[PDB]
Structure formats: C-alpha cells, structure tokens
Design a protein around this ligand. Structure first.
Ligand SMILES: Nc1ncnc2c1ncn2[C@@H]1O[C@H](COP(=O)(O)OP(=O)(O)OP(=O)(O)O)[C@@H](O)[C@H]1O
Ligand SMILES: Nc1ncnc2c1ncn2[C@@H]1O[C@H](COP(=O)(O)OP(=O)(O)OP(=O)(O)O)[C@@H](O)[C@H]1O
Ligand SMILES: Nc1ncnc2c1ncn2[C@@H]1O[C@H](COP(=O)(O)OP(=O)(O)OP(=O)(O)O)[C@@H](O)[C@H]1O
Ligand SMILES: Nc1ncnc2c1ncn2[C@@H]1O[C@H](COP(=O)(O)OP(=O)(O)OP(=O)(O)O)[C@@H](O)[C@H]1O
Ligand SMILES: Nc1ncnc2c1ncn2[C@@H]1O[C@H](COP(=O)(O)OP(=O)(O)OP(=O)(O)O)[C@@H](O)[C@H]1O
Ligand SMILES: Nc1ncnc2c1ncn2[C@@H]1O[C@H](COP(=O)(O)OP(=O)(O)OP(=O)(O)O)[C@@H](O)[C@H]1O
Ligand SMILES: [Ca+2]
Ligand SMILES: [Ca+2]
Ligand SMILES: [Ca+2]
Ligand SMILES: [Ca+2]
Ligand SMILES: [Ca+2]
Ligand SMILES: [Ca+2]
Lengths: 306, 306, 306, 306, 306, 306
C-alpha cells in the first residue's frame, strides 16, 4: 500500500541516479520507448527495432553475420541515407568485393563516396581515425573485421585502436560501422550490435530472386536491446522497404486493405502487394508520409519528409 | 393586472434559473420551437417532430418497436446522412440480419462503414466505448438491446456501461443509437427515445410493397416531446422522403397542386404524386431546396443545401 | 405690379407649405399635370384622366356604377396589367358572377389569380387585410361593397376595417380596388373614386355588341379630379384600347389619317378603323409605341414598352 | 512695288476684319467663287448663278416676277428637291391656284406636303412662324406677298412679322421662300432675291409649249450677286434641266457633240437635243453624274449622286 | 631529459634575443611559416615560395636571370598587382625594350604608369630616390642593373646610391625592384633576391608558345630562403596563374579531379586543364576564392578577394 | 667658417631690426615667399606675381598702362572679387567710358555698386576720402589720374590729397585703386604699382577677339617686386582665368594632359584647351579647387573655396 508507494519512489530515484552516474541507456526496462540523432538503416522494421529510428550517430556499430546475409546491403543503405541527410561518407575496404552498380541502385552517390583499401589492419584503423578526427566525415563503414590482418602476419590490435578511435568518435559525432563476418574489443565499445542472417529464399518460379532476412539487435545502448526485424532483401534492390511500409502500415491500421487493393487516406495505392510497392517506389514522398505515420504510431522518431 | 405582470415576471425568472441550474431542455413548454447540431433521420416528418431537425449529436438515442417496424431503416438512413456530413460511422451488430444491398440503396457507403459482431453484451458496450473514446467516430448504431446477452448467460450490465459510455459521449460529441426490439437504464440516459410501429400496408395490386409508419418521440431532451411523424416505408427504398416533401410542402403552401400537377416556383414537378416523387428523386438539389423551405416555415433548422 | 409679384410669391409659398404639411395632392390647380407608380386600367383615356397614367399603387380605389356599366371589366383589366408588371393579384368575391373565359380574354392569367368567396363582410375585410399584410400581394379586387353583409344580418363595419386596412396598405404598397354597385367610409379613405356608366349601345345590325362607356374621376388625390374618359366596351373584348390609341393618336397628330387609311411613321396600319384596330391588336409592340407617344404628348407618364 | 505689297496687305486685312465684324458675305468681289448648305432650285443654271449651288438653307428667299414667269414652278421644284434630301415641306397659300398634277410631275410628294390657306396676312405669317419654331420643317413656301391682306382690310405687317420670323429661322435652319407678284421689309431680310421673267415663247408648230425664262439674282448674301440664268420652262415639265446639262456640259467640254450625237465618256446619249434630253430623263443617275462634273468645273458645290 | 628542457629553453631565449637585437628575419628555421604587407608577383607558386605571399613592401628586391627568362614579366605583373591595390607605380628604363601591349595584357594600367629613361646610371638612381622620397610612389621597377652606365664611361655607384636609397625606402614604405641581367651592393641591401630561368619549351605543334620557368628565392629576409616555384610563362599571357591554382589546388585537395573534369565546391570548372584554366580566367572572383583557400592550406597570407 | 656663421647671424639680426624699425616689407630678398589679407585681381598669374595672392587690403594701388591694355578690366574684376567676399565697392569715374554689360559679364553686381562722376579732381579725392572715412566701403576704384583736372584749370593736388587719404585708408582698411593712363605722389604712397600692356592679338580667323596681356609688378611693399604675369584678355570675358588654371595647373603637375585631354584627379575636364576652359567655367567649384592647389604649390595664399 504505502509499501508499494515507498517501493516505487525508491526505484525511480535509483534509476534516475544510475542514469546520472553511469550515463543514459545504462539501465532500461525491456519495453521502454524513447523520448536522439539517428541515421536510417534503410529498413523500417530495423529502424523500429533500434528504438530511436535508426543507428545512433557519434557511436560505434557492429554488424555481423554469415556471408550474403545482408551486412554490406545494410551499410550501403546507411551510406545512401546519410548522403540524403547531406553527410559525407567513407568506405574502408579490406574485402575487395564492392559492386558499385548495386551501391548506386541502393542510392549511394559514388561521386561523393570516399574509398580506402588499406595495406594492413593497423593502417585501416589509423586511416579511420584520421577521417574521424577531420570533423568533416559523418559516417565510415569498415569492411571487414577478420580481414584486418596485422602487418607482422602479412609479413589487441582492435583493442588499442578502438580505445583511440572511440575517443575521436565522441568528440566529432562521426558514426562508424564495422562489418564482421562469422571482434572482441568491439563487443564493449559498440553502442549497437546487429546479428543478421538469411532465413529463407524468395523465388520467382525456381529462380531465387532474394532472401528473407532477420536482424536481431543483440546490444543496444540507446534504447532497449533484443528486438528483431524481418524483411526481404531482393537481388539488385536491397531491403524491400516499401513492402515493410505496406505490411506494418496495414498491421497498425494506417494503410487499408480493401479487397484486393491497398489504400491510404481513401486513395488506392495498388492492386496486390507488388503493384502497391511499385507505386510507393514511384511516389517516394507518399511512401515517406506513410512511413512516418507508422513510426509515430509505434513511438519511434520520424524521418525527414519533404 | 399588475398581478399578471408580476406573475409572468416570476415565471420567466424561474424558467431561466431552472435552465441555468439543471441544463437546457430541463423544463419546456409543449409547443416550444427552437433557437443545435443534428443529424437527419432521413424522414422530414420525424426531423420536424424532433424539433431540432434531426437526432441531437453527442447524445444517446433509443429507437424501439416491433420487428419490421422500421428501426433498422431509420438507423441506416441516419448513417447515410452522417456520411453525407463527412462523418465516420460504425454498426455494432448482435442481430446478424443486416442487408447491405438495402443499406447501399439507402445511401450507406459500405467502404467507410465500420462493423463489429461482438462475442457478448459486455464486449459490445466496451467496443462501443473504445470507438467513442477515439474522438474519430461520429455515429455508432448498436443492434440490438435484447440481443446483448451477458457472458455468464452465454456460458445492471446496461447500467454501469451506460454510465461509462455517456461520460465518453459527452467528451467527444459522438452520437450513439441503440435499437431495441419490443433497456431500463437506457430510459434515463437517452436524450431521445423513439417509438416506431407499422400502422398499415401499402399495396400494389394485392402485393404489399411497403408500410405506413408512425414514429412518436416519447422522450426529447433537446426540444419538446410527444410529437409524431407519419410516413411510408417502401421495400427497398426506405422512408418516402420525397413524398413527405410534396405532402408537407403542399400543406404549408410551399408547393402548389395545380390540377393534376405538383408545381414549385411556377414550374411543374410532375403529374400525380408518383411522378412528382420520382422527379424529386432525380433532382435532389431541388428536393433539398423545397425541404429546407418547409423546415423554415415550421421553425425547424435547415439541412445543408448545395 | 410689385403687388402682382408679391401676390404670386405668397401663393407659391403657401401652396408649398400646404403640400409639406398636409401631403402631396392636398391642393392642386384643376389643369395641373404631373411630375408616381401606377397600374394601367386598360383604358388609355382613363389612364390619361387619372393624370398619373393609371391607378396609384399603395392606395385604395373605389369604382362604382350601375350593373353592366363596366366595373368588373375595368378591374379584370387592372389585374391583367398588374400581372404584366409581374405582380400577384387576388379577387375577393361576394357576387359569384365572375366569368373566367372573359377574364382570360382580357389577359388575366388564372393560374396565378388568388380567389376568395368569404362567409361574411367581416371575413372579406379580414382576409383582405391578411393578404395586404403578407407584403407579397400587389393588387386586390373586392367585389362588391353592398354584398358585404354583416354576420349578424346573415344570421361602421366598412369604417373600422378601412382604418385597419389603410394602415396595412400604406406599409406594403398594395393596391386595393373596391367595386360598388349603385360605401361611405370608402369616400374618405379612397385616393381615387371612379363613376362609370353606359352611355349608349354599340350595334352590328340590330345586334348590340357593346356599349359606349363614360368614366368620371370624381375623387383624385394623386392628380387633379373630375376628368372624364369615353371609350367602347365590346362584349368579350373589354375596352377597345386600340380604338383609343387610333382616336387619340390621330387627334394629337401622332397618327395620320390618309384618305381611308390610318398610318404611323409613314407606314399604313389599316384601311378604316376596324382594320387598323385589328392590326394594332396583332402588333402589340407597335400599339404600345404609339400609345406611349400619345401619353408623352399629353404629359402623362409612359407604360413599359419592349 | 512695296507700295503694291503694302496696299494688298491692307486690303486683305480689312476684308478679313469686315467679314469677322459684319458677317460672311458682307463684302465680296463680283467674280468670287465659294469655299455651305443649299437646296437646289431644279435649274442647273440658276444653282450656278447662286454660287453655292442652290438656295441657302436657314435663310429667307424672295422670288418675284410677272404672273406665269415661273415663280411657282421654281418653288415646287425646290420642294421636290428638299423632299429628295429627306426634308419636310409646307406650302402656305393665299393664291388658291396650285395644280397638284403639275406639282407631282415636278416631283413633289403630295403625301408629305403640308398645306395652309390662311384667313389673313397676319395668320399666314403666324402659321409660318409656328412651323419654323417646330424645328421639324425644312422648307416653307409662302404664296404670295400681295395676297397677304391685313385682317382690318378684309373687314408694317410684313415688317414686324419678318423680324420675329427671321429670329426663328436663324435658330432652326428652316428655309422660307416668299413668292411676290409684280414686299419692302422683305428686301432687307431676304438673303437671296430672284427676279424671274418670260423672255420668249417656245413653240411646236404654232402651239406654244413653253417659255424661255431669265432669272437674275438681284440680291445674294451667300455669294456674289447679279448673275443670271437662262433656261426653258415647258408646260407640264418645269425647267428643262436635262437641256441645261447638255448645253452647259457641252459648253464646258464635259459632254461631246459628235456630228449629230451628244456623247459622254465615249458613249452616245442621243441623236439631237430632244433625244439626248429624253435619255438623261430616263437615266437620272447619269444625268446627275454629268451635272456634278459641270458644277465642279465651274467651282460650284455638287449635289448628291447615288 | 631536464637536459633537453634546459636546452630548448636556452635556444628559445637566444632566438628571441637575436630577433630583438638584430631584427626580425635575422635567424629562422628553414621550414618556418609566417605569422606582413606584401604585393603579389602574379605567380601563386612564387608568392608561396616567398612565404609572406608576395614581395615585401618597403624593401629592395633583386630579380636576376638570363634574357627572356621572365624577369620583366614578373615585374610587370607586380606592377599590375600593385595598381590593383590602388598603388602608384614607376618604371625606370635603361633597356628600351618595354612592350606596352604585353604590359596591358598583363593588367598594367598604362594611364597611371610613370616612366623614366635616364641619361646615366647616376641619374637613374637619383630619380629613383626622388620618387621614393615623394611618399606617393608605391612600387618602382628599375630595368636594368648592367645598363646603368656611369656618366664618365658614357663620356661603387650602386653602393653609395643604395645606401641613400635604402634610407629613403625605409621611411616611406616604397617597394623597389631591380632587374639584373646575367649588382654586388645589391646583394646585401636586397631583402629578397630571385634567380629566374627558363627550364623548357612549351609547344603547340612545333611552334613554341611559352616556357617552363623556375624561380629560386636565393635570399629572403622576411621568411625562410631557398624555396622554389615552377610555372609556365606563355607568350602574350605571362605566368599561367590559373594553371597554378588548378595544379596546387588539386594537389592540396581543394580542387577535385573527377574523371576528365576539374571541379570545386561540387561544381565543374572545366573538362581538361585548358578548359578549366579558361573558365577561371573568365571567373576571376572564383579563381581568387580558390587561390586563397590554397594559400590558407599552406600557411601563406591571403590576397584580397571581393 | 665661423666667419660665415658670424656673418649670417649679423645679417639676420639686421634684417629683423630693419623690419621692426621701418615696417614689414621694407627689405626683402627677391625670391622670398610669404608667411596677409588680399583681394583677387581675377588673374591667377597676377595674384601669384603679387606674392600674397591678390591686391593688399587697406592700401593704395596704382594700375597704369596704355588705353585698352586691360586696366579697367582688372579693376572691374577686383570689384567682382571684393563683392564675392561680401565687400562694398565704389567707382569714382572721370572717364565716362564704363560699360556696365561688360562689368556684369565680369561678375560685378551693379545693384550694390556705388558710382560717382565728380565735378573736379579735388572733388574726386574728397569724395574718395569721405567714402574711406565711412568705415563701410571696402574697395574704391578711381578712374583715372590724368582726368583729375584741377578746378582752376576747368575754369600738388594729388600730393596733399594722398597724404590725407592714406591717413584715412590706414585707419579703415579700405583698398583704393587708381587707374592711370600713359601720378608722382602716387609713386610713393602706393603699396603696389602695376604696369599693364597688350603684347599681341588673339584672333579667330582674321577677327581679333582678344589680347595677350603682360602685367609687371613694378612696386610691391607686401612681397617682392618685379614679378610678371602673362594672360589673355578676351573681348566680353576679361582675363581667361580658367586658361591660367589649366596652364599653370599642368605646368606644376596638378593637372594632367592625357593625349588630347586635360584631366584632374583622374577625371577628364575636356578635350583641348577650349573645351576644358568651358568645363571649368561651368564648374566653378572645381575650378577653385584646382586653382587653390596651384596656389599652394607655389607658396601663395589660397582663395575661398566652398
Ligand atoms: N552486387 C550485387 N548485385 C545485386 N544484389 C546483390 C549484390 N550484392 C549483394 N546483393 C544482394 O544482397 C544479398 C546479401 O549481400 P551483402 O553483400 O549485402 O551481404 P554481406 O554479408 O556483406 O556479403 P559477403 O559476406 O559475401 O561480403 C545477396 O544475397 C544479394 O541478394
Ligand atoms: N433487406 C431489405 N430489403 C428491402 N427492404 C427492406 C429490407 N429490410 C427491411 N426492409 C423494409 O423496411 C421495413 C422494416 O425493416 P427494418 O429492418 O428497418 O425494421 P427493424 O425494426 O430493424 O427489423 P427487425 O426487427 O426485423 O430486425 C421492412 O418491412 C421492409 O419493408
Ligand atoms: N362574361 C362576359 N363575357 C363577355 N362580355 C362581358 C362579360 N361580362 C361583361 N361583359 C361585357 O362588359 C360589360 C359590363 O360588364 P361588367 O361585369 O364589367 O360590369 P359590372 O358593373 O361589374 O357588372 P355587374 O354589376 O352586372 O356585376 C357587359 O355589358 C358586357 O358587354
Ligand atoms: N398647272 C400647270 N400645268 C402645266 N404647266 C404649268 C402649270 N402651271 C404653270 N405651268 C407652266 O409654268 C409656267 C409658269 O407658271 P408658274 O405658276 O410657275 O408661274 P407663277 O409666276 O407662279 O404664276 P402665277 O403668277 O400665274 O400664279 C406656265 O407658263 C406654264 O408653262
Ligand atoms: N612583348 C611580348 N609579347 C608577348 N610575350 C612576351 C613579350 N615579352 C616577353 N614575353 C614572354 O615572356 C618571356 C620572357 O620575357 P621577359 O621580358 O619577361 O624576360 P626578361 O628577362 O626581362 O627579358 P630581356 O632580358 O630580354 O629584356 C618571353 O620568352 C615571352 O614568352
Ligand atoms: N565694353 C567692353 N566689352 C567687351 N570687352 C571689352 C569692353 N571694354 C574692354 N574690353 C576688353 O578689354 C580690353 C581692355 O579694355 P579696358 O577698358 O580694360 O582697358 P583700359 O586700360 O581701362 O582702357 P581705356 O584706357 O580705353 O579706358 C579691350 O581691348 C577689350 O578686349
Ligand atoms: Ca474509404
Ligand atoms: Ca403559376
Ligand atoms: Ca408620308
Ligand atoms: Ca561531389
Ligand atoms: Ca542691394
Ligand atoms: Ca589616371
């Protein structure tokens, strides 16, 4: 009774003192929402699972998973989203696999993309630090952890580098994403860790044209962890974000399914999911409007409209 | 003399204080007119009997009467009228008898009609409350009182629900109509109670094509009670409102009967009542113009023209 | 000399003060013309004798004379003229003698004619007052004075009624004509009093087809009194107005008689009076043009052309 | 030398000042031409002698001469010419000799001719004044001066009348011609005075069919005086104007005499004068064309062609 | 350790005392930058090699080198730059080779250029002194050392003159440049000595249109000596300064080479070096903006923008 | 050595004592400048030759020379200059030759000019004395010496008069100029004596439009004597002062000759001397600005600008 009031008073005061003393995000409740500066992953479901609506800026991010699970796709979409915000992006490459026609399809502006193919793991982290320290680079993607071979071996690395790097990152608000194939110092320094995997084939006839994808946020220091997103990745197209908008939009009653049609605000979008997705692809301002309504319904920060 | 002046002064001051203290409509004179936000019943005669020109918005309405007397017809017309105003409508159904071809003939837009077929009487009133609380539903029809069986029985309900519901209704201006076949808590919470019954057959040859209908306003908190309306309900067509317009229009000298013809503003409408009704059906803007003149002559608020 | 100037100055100033104090028309000179809103009697000669070109609107008119002298004819023509102006007319009948084929021949539109056959003299004047008070009736004919029997007798009337009626008439600009067969309160309230009588037969062979008619304006408050008009009334046709136009037109040099022909503006109208009258009947716009020239020559207001 | 220049400068300036001060026509040179609104006399030779091509409008004209010299003929032709211009004419007759078959032969439209046969000389001049004052009469012929007997005698007249009449004539542009048989006040008020006389017989066999006629302009205030015209007047036909056109036309080289033929513009008109005159009578538009060329050659204003 | 701190303390204090006692620039470190009032040489590379961004004002300058190496070009550009600053310039000529079409192409305003062709070496230095002493001449070019023949010979000079001249120069802030063909007193008095030579031909086909040029700063009292600049001199155009801006701009990452294009601030300048140079020639405010960014990157004072 | 120092010390002390004892101007060096209250002669060259920039105020001036050499011109210009200073002027005339259109062209305000034509030489000097003694006349011109005939002769004069007059002149600061045609007492009392003569014709075609003029200051007590001025006097225009400004201005480097143009402060004045003179005439404030710079360069006091 007064026991319960006394107990809730004490919990609140402790939670507040913990946040003051150890920093925001140090203790959360598992289903907490958010009251934030983020860059979209290009997946609405993943932006929602992240709680703040995207990857947090000025932080270290790790994305790991088996090859062809969607890691590079997610980072190229993040680059395209950051470029849309007006930000400058760099790709530090130790894998030599980038396909720039694909990057372009995902919205990356290659004219403005910085690229580095470093001579060693040391050199990769030092170049990464130099770009962070410039104060003029907004997002860096490092591909990939394992490939970051020490000079001695070519003829604790991660750990001292990450110490130096995180120092720089905190001063300049640069976002840095490491792609890791499936390293340990990363586990503590990262504010967000994503576990991505293929969960099924998508097929046209017996031609596979894509993959069902699951991403789990296994570490999240800016909103509660362990949320998941499920979306399609289509060959040549990346995340089917328009599909997410229709699915989540209909689920949360923003978008109507009227017989065979998807409709929004009393107007038809398309007959069947493929037609409706294509219409949203052709009408990106409408797509963004609907997306933002879905974000608001779920308590997730909006993206830029306009 | 001065006795009479003193007496009239005292009556007026008491009536004014009663209205201030107990609310408008608490004491009226039986033939009072009105100085109001209403939705039409689809019957001109009933809108006139209601005094304010329709059902009052933000209030509870009860419509009761024997089966096939016209209750569902009146509520579907009210839905069509509310949709014409731009309002969102819901039908909460415990009778499983709705005919949507008929609803469409009466002008209901099924695309925009919310529908619920609840699992119990409790569930019906809770869903009704949730829709009222949304602030986004303008009119709810609940069919029907008796059918609202308590969960325990399936395996005071009305009374506590109506307490909660009327609280919500007053905050959001939602209109809620209960259809009752021939419950007690309704008698006090309802601002308007309608008693509807069939009073005769309408025939083509020996084929009955409709029914003469009488509606009595047995409770009216927004204008004086106990007025009545008489109109035809035709199978497949609902209230013969064009017939009411010609009848009341001619009665109150707005519409002329010139020999065999009905005429308005010096122009023929049709030869005989059937032809004139059909012409008004084909010329709804004229029908509304004449209807509104009749309303004005009787001291009843107008509907939207245009 | 200066005596004459002083005397004319004094007369003028008195006449002006009398008009200001007692109202226009209170003192006139017997051959005064006019500087007016009127409705034609259907007789050009009578419209001229009235000075203002017709009966004055917003006033009481009395027309009296022996039966079959032309009273009803004059009032039906006045109705037809008022309807031509767009005005609404009523006939209050205590004589039960109206012939509506004749009324139609005289140009009355029966569709728009209000009719009343009152239960008593009181009822006649009360209905007359109600029509005046509507503000929507332009001309009322009351037939006839003597027939207006008091209720008590059926089982001062005129006088108190005329007091009330003239009050209403002055507010609404309604014209009211009383037909009187040959009452006293009428003598003062009437602005115009007409004395009409038959003065001779008109014959085809030994078949009488009409009557020579004399109307004397015995009271005139809107222009000088005691002028007279002489015209034919033909069975089935009313006043021979085309005959008046030719006669007065030729008299005042507007219309030419060239040998056997009547001519206007250098063009033949017809050979002999009957042919010329028929031509004007067939060419009413020409008839009106010539009529208006005659009115202008005599200092009488014009009618509508077009 | 400079004497001559100084003298011509002074003369011109005086002539200009005289015209400004005393009016146009006050001083002229005897052979002056003209730079005018006129009505033809029906004689080309006389229209030329008048300088302005006809009698001046808005002026008083006197025509005097022995009986049968051609006075009435000239005035009837002037009437016919004025009617051709669209003007309204009046004949004020104290002689009782008019032959209207002759007037018609000369082109007078009797339908439009006003006629007066006054009771006295006074009455004649007063009617003349009233017609002038109308502003609607273009030409008045008064026949004849001597016959204008004073009332007293029947049981200075001309002089006070002419004062009043000339006042009216100047305001309204009416032309007034007085025929005088062979009065003194006329000598000064008239702008033009014509002296007409027979100078010889015209014969067919020993049948006289006409008369050689001489007209002298003894007073002319609109162009120089004392010019003369000589022409034939034929019984029943008036002035032989076609003969004048051929004579003056050939004299001034407009018309050719080719052997026995008269020709104009390279085309034969007729063999011998009689045939050529008749052809011009039958072809009045050609006659007018040739007449106007002759007028132009002589510096005389043209008539209407068409 | 503390040995090193003690040693660095002592060096700094000595360097500071040397500067105070012998003057700024007396001891420098070879790669020192600068913390200055300068006039541009018209070569960005040479302005950079000079450290302060141009020739120092209020000082003596020597420029020496073989004929046609670019000496006169550099001094005419310095004149044009000084005139751009609003300064008054003089050219003292003992060589008689000036081409003023070329001077104009290089931006010299001939209207404001003072010119002297002295009678002897003595007279040249005395006129130079008089111009310096005026306090109204900002830059003097003396062409050329060897040609400055003593009067006695025409029928130590430099040394006593330079003593007097440097006294005047220090009081008035006049800049004086001596052109020397390849004198000894100059070696000590000069604050800056430039060694310029042709190092190669520039060709269009087999037509030589210019020369590769090297300038070495062999003496520099205002910033460290022995730096070098390499640039093109084109016949008729002088130093290719726009070429320097593109080269140094791209080298120091201010200007982008994107495929075949040079670009700055995200906007194309031109396809290939010639087109980009011409664009900068046509857009001098942009050229200056880019030049100044390059200066800032290298630690060199800026020029006036605007 | 010390001989030279002793000698220069002695000279200076003697010169200083001579000035104290005999008055300023008693001993000068021939090329001395000046350290003064003056009125301009209207000639810049003459104002410069006078050393103090004009005639000295409060002194006697003699101007002598052959007729038409420019004496009257110089005195009328002096009057115009004195009036410009706000001073009151008088002209005492024994020659009767003054042309006041010319005086006006030279800038004399005739409204304010006092004039006297005395009866004798005695009377002239007595009136001159009375005007001086008023304390209210600033400049008096006496024309002319020879014409100043003694009364006895009409039926030593100069000498006793000049004694009295110079006494008055010294008290009141009046300037008095005597014009003398080519008297002895004048030679000593005058502070300034001018010898003016024509030295050549100025011609347009073979029309002489003016005269080259030389003025020598043969006596000067306020600055060194014997300086000369040469200027044009143009018929109707007086001294060509704008021409002097351009000539002396260009000579002393204030005004530029740039090709065919005269220019000042970088702005064109006119193409050729005539155009430049006219521009300065139209822009008197500029003319004065340039004139004053020339005066300052020569060590001569300035005139009022503004
Ligand atoms: N160049 C490309 N063109 C078209 N689609 C591509 C391309 N690369 C990848 N994809 C799509 O994205 C899916 C995952 O590829 P992605 O490179 O994003 O994963 P990854 O984990 O970075 O791969 P890896 O480990 O092989 O370097 C692929 O299965 C394919 O459907
Ligand atoms: N589906 C329909 N099609 C055509 N006409 C109908 C239909 N339903 C009702 N009507 C007309 O309206 C009349 C009354 O029906 P309505 O359903 O409005 O009354 P109710 O009181 O709600 O009925 P119940 O009590 O049977 O559910 C009927 O007699 C019929 O004439
Ligand atoms: N029904 C009719 N048809 C044709 N002509 C008619 C008719 N009624 C009247 N007239 C003509 O008009 C004349 C006068 O009739 P009117 O009714 O105008 O006079 P009244 O004074 O109103 O008559 P009463 O006193 O008989 O009611 C008649 O003599 C007749 O020539
Ligand atoms: N009625 C006529 N019919 C034919 N020709 C006529 C007629 N009247 C006149 N003429 C011709 O005109 C000539 C002159 O007649 P006119 O009447 O013009 O002269 P007048 O001076 O007015 O005559 P009077 O003085 O006789 O009244 C006659 O000689 C005749 O040739
Ligand atoms: N009059 C000119 N027109 C065009 N280009 C010129 C001209 N003079 C010089 N140049 C260009 O500049 C280069 C060097 O000439 P400049 O006179 O600047 O050198 P310099 O050392 O002063 O010459 P010199 O020693 O011959 O007097 C030439 O090779 C030529 O390309
Ligand atoms: N009235 C005038 N109009 C125009 N120019 C004149 C006039 N008077 C003099 N000048 C110009 O000035 C010149 C000298 O005249 P000015 O009268 O100044 O000399 P002066 O020595 O006083 O003459 P004088 O001895 O004849 O009285 C003349 O040659 C003429 O060019
Ligand atoms: Ca809808
Ligand atoms: Ca009607
Ligand atoms: Ca006619
Ligand atoms: Ca770019
Ligand atoms: Ca004054
Ligand atoms: Ca210049």
């Amino acid at each position: 009774a007064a026991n319960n009031s006394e107990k809730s008073k004490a919990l609140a005061a402790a939670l507040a003192q913990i946040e003051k003393q150890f920093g925001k995000g140090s203790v959360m409740r598992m289903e907490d929402g958010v009251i934030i500066q983020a860059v979209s992953t290009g997946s609405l479901g993943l932006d929602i699972a992240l709680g703040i609506g995207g990857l947090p800026r000025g932080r270290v991010i790790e994305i790991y998973g088996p090859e062809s699970s969607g890691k590079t796709t997610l980072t190229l979409q993040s680059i395209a989203e950051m470029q849309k915000l007006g930000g400058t992006c760099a790709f530090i490459d130790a894998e030599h696999a980038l396909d720039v026609t694909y990057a372009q399809k995902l919205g990356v502006n290659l004219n403005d993309l910085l690229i580095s193919q470093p001579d060693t793991g040391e050199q990769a982290l030092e170049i990464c630090d130099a770009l962070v320290r410039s104060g003029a680079v907004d997002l860096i993607v490092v591909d990939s952890v394992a490939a970051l071979t020490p000079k001695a071996e070519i003829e604790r690395l991660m750990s001292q580098a990450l110490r130096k790097l995180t120092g720089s990152i905190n001063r300049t608000n640069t976002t840095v994403i490491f792609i890791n194939q499936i390293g340990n110092a990363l586990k503590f320094y990262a504010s967000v860790r994503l576990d991505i995997r293929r969960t099924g084939s998508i097929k046209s006839g017996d031609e596979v044209i894509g993959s069902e994808t699951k991403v789990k946020v296994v570490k999240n220091k800016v909103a509660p962890p362990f949320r998941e997103a499920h979306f399609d990745i289509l060959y040549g197209e990346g995340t089917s974000r328009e599909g997410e908008i229709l699915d989540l939009g209909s689920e949360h009653k923003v978008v109507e399914k009227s017989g065979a049609w998807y409709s929004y605000n009393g107007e038809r979008i398309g007959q069947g999911k493929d037609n409706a997705r294509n219409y949203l692809k052709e009408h990106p301002e409408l797509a963004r409007e609907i997306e933002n309504k879905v974000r608001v319904a779920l308590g997730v920060p909006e993206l830029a409209g306009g």
